[PDB]
């Protein structure tokens, strides 16, 4: 019934600019306060700002008023967030929200990635099973898919034949602007050496296809 | 300026749980218009409370707002497993909101599960690439809250590690976590012992997995 449709998610370089939009339907946009917040892993939820129906009060958190600008167009039911001179720590999912007593209505989110990195294929390293990676009748092994840009990478094990106990973790964006990811699998401790374990990694942006055998 | 909440709380279905919200400037008062927002998986945000006491339309009655001592507070009466989620507090300071760090609320869906801890030394391949990554894996654990500390030569690390967590398992409600400690080959070779220390609810003592370079 109520939809906050956000648009304008993508990649921007340090020092660049960007404008996100959020089109509201199902409520009388001209009668709601609107607000912008952002969510980043490890940085929790941060309130960016808010704007009244008539735009004559635009409140910002002092830390971000310098290079963030909130605006709205009531005739087109649209809320805008502009960001200038962005930096690496501005990487986050930005959300528009509409006040009704509290933060009542929410958009779907807009990913903004600030990185100076170039397109780059991953290095696939073996996470080797050992004494240090064994517990009971279970040994952990895996692959570290490191220093690639942009997302995503697809990881399978034994060309898809091995699926149970497979945990492919969300990638993390490193200080260098490149992503790193881990994919692990647990197998019987007695299975080591008897069976072969190979991680298949594909990163299309760099035409990278790598098959890595993981030895104890 | 800074808003602080409990990092994690555990309750059981049907029980009462109270989360608090502190201001670094002073006692939390009604003019801080404490807001409470819930985050469920897939970044599903739900406004719970505004201006300390007022429920957002549609929020069930079991979510209540109050002031307790010098803090704001959210109380969940008869907690449900669906209430398992992160709860962010927000305080108003004249002309801007400040969110707290959030409280991970567990509403026990099962017995507590301690993590299985594995550590992976770096590849010879990576070392030839000039870097070194030590990986610490916590497999199948519940609740989500857990502290993973890197210790190098028996000394706390900071600023050179990153964590990532899987989505909660649909069938056994467990999590898995990967923490990567990344250094340059030189920095990695300037030390001897590398250890991952893990603290979790299902652990009587912190568990440590270590190796010698």
């Amino acid at each position: 019934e109520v939809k906050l449709h956000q648009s304008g998610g993508g990649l921007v370089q340090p020092g660049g600019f960007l404008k996100i939009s959020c089109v509201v339907s199902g409520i009388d946009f001209s009668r709601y306060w609107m607000s912008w917040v952002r969510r980043a892993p490890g940085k929790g939820l941060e309130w960016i700002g808010e704007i009244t129906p008539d735009s004559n009060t635009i409140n910002y958190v002092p830390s971000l008023k310098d290079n963030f600008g909130i605006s709205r167009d009531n005739a087109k039911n649209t809320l805008f967030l502009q960001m200038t001179k962005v930096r690496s720590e501005d990487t986050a999912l930005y959300f528009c929200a509409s006040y009704y007593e509290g933060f009542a209505y929410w958009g779907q989110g807009t990913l903004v990635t600030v990185s100076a990195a170039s397109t780059k294929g991953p290095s696939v390293f073996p996470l080797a099973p050992s004494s240090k990676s064994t517990s009971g009748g279970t040994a952990a092994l895996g692959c570290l898919v490191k220093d690639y840009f942009p997302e995503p990478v697809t990881v399978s094990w034994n060309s898809g034949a091995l699926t149970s106990g497979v945990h492919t973790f969300p990638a993390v964006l490193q200080s260098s602007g490149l992503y790193s990811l881990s994919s692990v699998v647990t197998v019987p401790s007695s299975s080591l050496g008897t069976q072969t374990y190979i991680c298949n990694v594909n990163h299309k942006p760099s035409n990278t296809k790598v098959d890595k055998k993981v030895e104890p | 300026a800074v808003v602080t909440q409990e990092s994690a709380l555990t309750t059981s279905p049907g029980e009462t749980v109270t989360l608090t919200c502190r201001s670094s400037t002073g006692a939390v008062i009604t003019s801080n218009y404490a807001n409470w927002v819930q985050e469920k998986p897939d970044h599903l945000f739900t406004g719970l409370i505004g201006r300390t006491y007022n429920r957002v339309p549609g929020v069930p009655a079991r979510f209540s707002g109050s002031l307790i001592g010098d803090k704001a507070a959210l109380t969940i009466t008869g907690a449900q497993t669906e209430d398992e989620a992160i709860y962010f507090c927000a305080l108003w300071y004249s002309n801007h909101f400040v969110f707290g760090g959030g409280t991970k609320l567990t509403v026990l869906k099962r017995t507590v599960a301690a993590p299985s801890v594995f550590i992976f030394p770096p590849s010879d391949e990576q070392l030839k690439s000039g870097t070194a990554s030590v990986v610490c894996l916590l497999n199948n654990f519940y609740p989500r809250e857990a502290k993973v500390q890197w210790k190098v030569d028996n000394a706390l690390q900071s600023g050179n590690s990153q964590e990532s967590v899987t989505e909660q398992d649909s069938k056994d409600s467990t999590y898995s976590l990967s923490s990567t400690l990344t250094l340059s080959k030189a920095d990695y070779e300037k030390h001897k012992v590398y250890a991952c220390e893990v603290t979790h609810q299902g652990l009587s003592s912190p568990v440590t997995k270590s190796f010698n370079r």
């Binding site: 009668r31 009704y100 | 108003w92």
Partner: peptide, 12 residues
């Protein structure tokens, strides 16, 4: 033309 009501904000 009567303004009409608006949606209540989170802060007062």
């Amino acid at each position: 033309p009567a303004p009409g009501s608006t949606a209540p904000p989170a802060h007062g």
